[PDB]
């Protein structure tokens, strides 16, 4: 369909879900899916992505998302390879009523193949600006 509308509706869904049920966030992904939600090493360098629904789940729960409140200030979305949709997102996130922090995020939504209008998140790249800059 319309890449703009697909990406706008996915972002709403993602951040609704991150708030209401983060234990089910992992359902957006598949076996090849890449995920990072910021963080950094013992060397102070940004944390590596993990892959697949199972590892993505173990990682979402280590973030201990509770009352995750998000303000989205930019969303764009565009047709990419194979009628996929790339989504750029900037906004602010507070988890557990902690600091309001700025983030830069990219998504790639890929058609699942089975039905019109069914996608999965092939890539989810989130970074907080305070960890990188």
């Amino acid at each position: 369909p319309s890449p703009l509308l697909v990406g706008r509706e996915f972002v709403r869904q993602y951040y609704t879900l991150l708030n209401q049920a983060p234990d089910m966030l992992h359902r957006f992904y598949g076996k090849n899916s890449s995920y990072v939600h910021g963080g950094l090493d013992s060397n102070g360098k940004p944390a590596d992505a993990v892959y697949g629904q199972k590892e993505i789940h173990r990682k979402v729960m280590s973030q201990n998302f509770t009352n995750c409140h998000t303000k989205i200030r930019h969303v764009d979305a565009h047709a990419t390879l194979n009628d996929g949709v790339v989504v750029q997102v900037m906004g602010l996130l507070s988890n557990n009523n902690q600091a309001l922090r700025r983030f830069m995020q990219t998504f790639v939504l890929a058609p699942e193949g089975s039905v019109a209008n069914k996608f999965y998140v092939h890539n989810d790249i989130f970074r907080y600006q305070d960890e990188v800059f």
Partner: peptide, 9 residues
């Protein structure tokens, strides 16, 4: 419309 959700694993 628009489904984004997949089966568990």
């Amino acid at each position: 419309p628009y489904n984004f959700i997949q089966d568990s694993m």
